Ligand binder design. Structure first.
Ligand SMILES: CCCCCCCCCCNCCSSCc1ccc(Cl)cc1
Ligand SMILES: *SCCNCCCCCCCCCC
Length: 962
């Protein structure tokens, strides 16, 4: 029931739609009849050069529909007030405050979620209004608390075990399962929680259940709270702020007025905003602020220098601001459509004003439109800075979720467009088939190809000026000379951006950027949480670190055919849940809704035949009348995934077949499976039937029986279709669609009839979801002889394998690029850089200054313990000693390359005379008896020094540039 309308298809609106489609709402409808201008290609990556003139919504819908095949996207050319009732949430962008009041006054009374967002230069605002009765089922990002119990006392004190999870509140509810000693406590009815200590909590007197209870598990049941939102009209007078930065606490009240005057200016100028850095327009703009500050009886004192800056940047359109605001706003849409997180309440006024360049001229003349696709960025940073961007040489590590967002941001900014510019992208991974509907740049035609290579191509279409400027690799940023990114590669670079969660890559990328003194931008995400890190040479610390810890991933052939751990069966069970009770239901509902679904699915779907077979199987062939046919369907699924597929697997590879070597095929990570025969009196087998049949009946809206006498009756006369393993099946280690379409009932014959999709939810123990995943996982584990896991461990493992969220991924990419322009400006003051952290689930945002690098003094001069070093050519050993004595006032006492002692000042001339005239590279090759590798272009030396008085002075390492 989560229909989303999005008003406005500029840079901001197209980012929100991208994330909302990739997040997977019911449907998205766009509204933007305005013709495409040239200045919209500053942040609108779905508009090309020869799309100028056409309405922005019509050109962008075909690119949105290609994102997620289970999210129908449509366009409206007209907008009615009553038409808004077709949507659970309404997002408004690029709209005057006049129309916002007209829209919000309706949505607030009809209980329609309202979000208004605007990207205006380096300034932005987000307003949320979810009605005055909005119910939220989860007020924090935390999953419901679970853990094992030590004991429960008769007074009601529950002492928690080694787990001691985090963290309980008062008024929460917990339910108990398998707590021995108190039988009636495991019924399922929750109990109130009063926390006594960090390991205990009280549930009330349980003396009516037993003297002492032991063991068991507790699961928190979160009580839904209600949140009263004020309308835009009444919050315009009394605004409630959410602060993105407590250091800019005095700025939201200024921003609240400036954005209102920003619309009062558009009313007086045919909807146009003030001109870039225009003093005449900003003078008129300040006056508007002065009027609105008086009528709203605001006690604030107008920061004229700050407010006028909003006018100077009014018509700026930065892709970084669209990524940051767009990801956050899309997360608010999901809060409105799932009721699962705490919304922004209600005003989120934001700036990244420190990103404003200072090494170039910012004026009317510099920020004047040029007629190109970068006008929206030039309107803020100026024309001279645009060439600084265009000549950048960047190195992006990783082409997954964050890397693709990063490349998108670089293509809209003109990075590496100019003469000396170049982009280098690397990622060893390839594109697979499972996650295609969650990928931004990847489509079904790219399966098997390299992520980095396809990402470069998709970005070169967003900005054709990047063709030939991007070089794609399939390499890890790894060991030293083996590289294969050597000294020549890193010295050309302007900066490095790390978009991988890999711990290996982070270590090397950090270490390499320190040695070559190149700026580093780092980013990572973990669910709703994310953080950004900027490393500036000769300024900040090289690590910052304390990002969120990473997560794992599994090979395709391991999950599908050769599992050997219980975590493999759980992922396989979670994906199965999606294929039986989710994706086919979505295909059916779209076929009954979108009239052009037949041709839309051919271009978008990864498996257009399975889409059509889903519609046929679920609408006619296997549509159940009663729950008794749901049990027969569930019984058929048992053979289909725990018997027929295993017979097929043993058919292609028998239990005792051999490889090319002659060794058994089933050995090591490959465990020999065994098909299951259905035992109705086996707990795992029966728990699957109940869970699958009840979930199948859920899709069709049928009453799920739980009487084992009904199951026993149906399963006795179950006649399966005779299965025999097929030959010529590959197991990994057009008009035919009209034929299936002729087997589909006409959409007109099924008006109003819909199927209810199953949205996976671990926190409700009554929806049979975890029951299904536990049973399907344990049954597959029984196939391959793997130790099964109870529903507690299964629920735990399933919670830690959720994919990266596109909302978090967008927000970091925007934060990284808002710190990118600071690096290009060459900012040298550490207070102007920001390390970000956020948690979209609670509307928390944090911007902290980077820590300075630690310093020390050598002969009264300050040096950088991290970034300073002695750069010497491949001179002789004697010449190196002379340099430190004559030019540094230091007597070198120990010289080494790694652990190899190259020189010590006490060595007799029997050792030194043969080595002092040697070049360092010749001295190194002689000591440890090894030839220098061909692309070993530098030599790192450690050195111990004494001053003039014989005391040891700590000095940096040496870099021999050979
Ligand atoms: C109840 C039905 C309501 C019907 C409303 C129909 C609106 C269609 C357009 C007609 N003129 C309204 C202009 S508002 S857009 C503000 C804006 C646009 C462009 C730029 Cl650059 C800046 C700002
Ligand atoms: S004063 C020069 C510093 N060398 C002595 C400190 C002990 C070094 C041990 C670790 C260095 C190995 C290089 C990887």
């Amino acid at each position: 029931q989560s229909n989303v309308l999005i008003i406005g298809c500029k840079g901001l609106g197209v980012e929100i739609a991208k994330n909302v489609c990739l997040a997977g709402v019911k449907s998205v409808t766009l509204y933007d009849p305005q013709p495409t201008r040239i200045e919209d290609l500053s942040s609108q990556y779905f508009l090309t050069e020869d799309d100028i003139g056409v309405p922005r919504a019509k050109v962008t819908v075909s690119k949105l529909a290609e994102l997620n095949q289970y999210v129908p996207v449509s366009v409206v050319d007209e907008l009615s007030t009553e038409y808004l009732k077709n949507f659970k949430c309404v997002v408004v962008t690029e709209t005057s405050l006049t129309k916002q009041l007209e829209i919000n006054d309706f949505t607030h009374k009809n209980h329609i979620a309202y979000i208004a967002a605007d990207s205006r230069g380096l300034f932005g605002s987000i307003f949320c209004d979810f009605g005055e009765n909005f119910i939220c089922t989860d007020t924090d990002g935390n999953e419901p608390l679970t853990g094992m119990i030590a004991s429960i006392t008769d007074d009601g004190v529950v002492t928690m075990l080694e787990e001691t999870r985090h963290g309980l509140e008062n008024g929460d509810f917990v339910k108990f399962t398998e707590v021995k000693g108190m039988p009636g406590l495991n019924d399922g009815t929750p109990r109130k929680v009063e926390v006594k200590g960090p390991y205990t909590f009280s549930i009330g007197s349980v003396k009516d259940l037993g003297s002492a209870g032991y063991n068991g598990v507790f699961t928190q049941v979160k009580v839904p709270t209600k949140i009263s939102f004020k309308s835009l009209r009444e919050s315009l007078k009394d605004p409630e702020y959410v602060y993105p930065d407590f250091g800019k606490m005095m700025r939201p009240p200024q921003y609240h007025i400036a954005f209102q005057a920003l619309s009062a200016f558009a009313d007086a100028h045919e909807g146009s905003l003030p001109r870039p850095r225009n003093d005449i327009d900003a003078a008129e703009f300040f006056e508007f602020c002065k009027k609105i500050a008086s009528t709203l009886q605001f006690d604030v004192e107008l920061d004229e220098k700050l407010i006028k800056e909003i006018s100077y940047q009014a018509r700026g359109d930065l892709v970084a601001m669209s990524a940051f605001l767009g990801g956050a706003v899309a997360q608010e849409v999901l809060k409105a459509t799932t009721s699962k997180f705490y919304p922004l309440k209600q005003y989120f006024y934001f700036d990244s004003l420190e990103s404003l360049p200072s090494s170039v001229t910012i004026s009317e003349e510099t920020c004047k439109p040029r007629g190109c696709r970068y006008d929206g960025q030039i309107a803020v940073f100026g024309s001279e800075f645009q060439e600084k961007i265009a000549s950048l040489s960047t190195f992006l590590v990783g082409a997954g979720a964050i890397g693709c967002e990063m490349l998108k941001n670089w293509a809209m900014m003109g990075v590496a467009t100019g003469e000396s510019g170049h982009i280098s992208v690397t990622d060893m991974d390839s594109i697979e088939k499972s996650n295609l509907n969650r990928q931004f740049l990847f489509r079904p035609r790219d399966v098997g190809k390299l992520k980095s290579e396809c990402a470069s191509t998709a970005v070169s279409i967003m900005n054709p000026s990047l063709t030939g400027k991007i070089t794609s690799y399939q390499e890890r940023v790894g060991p030293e000379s083996e590289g294969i990114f050597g000294d020549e590669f890193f010295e050309k670079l302007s900066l490095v951006t790390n978009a991988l969660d890999n711990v290996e890559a982070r270590m090397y990328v950090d270490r390499r950027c320190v040695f070559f003194e190149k700026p580093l931008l780092e980013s990572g995400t973990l669910g709703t949480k994310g953080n950004t890190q900027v490393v500036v040479p000769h300024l900040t610390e090289s690590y910052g670190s304390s990002q969120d810890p990473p997560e794992k991933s599994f090979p395709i052939a391991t999950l599908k055919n050769f599992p050997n751990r219980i975590e493999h069966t759980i992922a396989w069970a979670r994906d199965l849940f999606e294929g039986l009770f989710k994706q086919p239901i979505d295909n059916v509902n779209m076929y009954l809704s979108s009239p052009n679904f037949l041709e839309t699915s051919l271009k978008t779907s990864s498996n257009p035949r399975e889409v059509l077979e889903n519609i046929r199987d679920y609408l006619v062939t296997e549509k159940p009348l009663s729950f008794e046919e749901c049990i027969m369907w569930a019984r058929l699924q048992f053979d289909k995934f725990f018997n027929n597929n295993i017979q097929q697997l043993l058919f292609n590879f028998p239990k005792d077949s051999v490889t090319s070597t002659g060794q058994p095929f089933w050995s090591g990570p490959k465990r020999a499976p065994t098909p299951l025969s259905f035992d109705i009196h086996n707990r795992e087998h029966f728990d699957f039937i109940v869970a699958a049949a009840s979930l199948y009946a859920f899709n069709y809206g049928l009453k799920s029986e739980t009487d084992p006498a009904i199951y026993e009756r149906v399963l006795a006369g179950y006649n399966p279709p005779p299965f025999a393993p097929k030959s010529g099946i590959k197991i990994q280690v057009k008009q035919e669609l009209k034929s299936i379409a002729d087997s589909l009932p006409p959409p007109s014959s099924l008006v109003g009839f819909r199927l209810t999709p199953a949205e996976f939810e671990k926190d409700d123990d009554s929806n049979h979801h975890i029951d299904f995943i536990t049973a399907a996982s344990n049954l597959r584990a029984m196939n391959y002889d793997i130790t099964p896991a109870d529903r507690f461990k299964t629920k735990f493992v399933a919670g830690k394998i959720v994919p990266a969220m596109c909302t978090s991924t967008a927000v970091v990419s925007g934060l990284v690029c808002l710190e990118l322009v600071k690096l290009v400006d060459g900012k040298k003051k550490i207070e102007e850089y920001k390390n970000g952290f956020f948690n979209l689930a609670i509307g928390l945002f944090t911007f902290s200054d980077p820590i300075a690098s630690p310093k020390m003094k050598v002969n009264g001069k300050e040096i950088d313990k991290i970034w300073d070093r002695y750069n010497l050519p491949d001179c002789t050993l004697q010449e190196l000693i002379d340099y430190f004595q004559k030019e540094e006032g230091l007597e070198v006492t120990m010289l080494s390359s790694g652990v190899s002692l190259l020189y010590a000042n006490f060595q007799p001339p029997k050792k030194l005379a043969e080595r002092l005239p040697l070049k360092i590279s010749e001295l190194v090759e002689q000591i440890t008896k090894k030839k220098l590798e061909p692309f070993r272009k530098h030599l790192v030396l450690e050195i111990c020094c004494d001053d003039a008085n014989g005391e040891d002075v700590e000095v940096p390492f040496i870099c021999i540039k050979l």
